Design a protein around this nucleic acid. Sequence first.
DNA 1: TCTTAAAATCGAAGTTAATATAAACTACATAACAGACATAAGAACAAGTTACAGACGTATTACATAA
Length: 52
Amino acid sequence: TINKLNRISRQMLQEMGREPLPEELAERMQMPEDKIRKVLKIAKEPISMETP
DNA sequence: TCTTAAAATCGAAGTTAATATAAACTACATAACAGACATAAGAACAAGTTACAGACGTATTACATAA
């Protein structure tokens, strides 16, 4: 789901020229916008406790 | 006995607050969420059981009155 969201947001960005808003991404995925926001916020890799 | 690569060290506070690249379909089992029922726990009312209080009634004594 994350990978194919990345690819669809890829294609939309390259076709319109700007970062696609979650509403248009949900429209292209045929999935609810709440699910799109859940996927987008799911888990970015934890930052290290030694970052200067 | 003489090179030569490694190994280790190099002042205190003070402040400081992060990022950002890069398969799909299908089949099955399991966990989670919601609803309904039964059960245990508490709230409410009413009754009964019991002794004590509060003022009354009684009993006793002393003063007054009558013979």
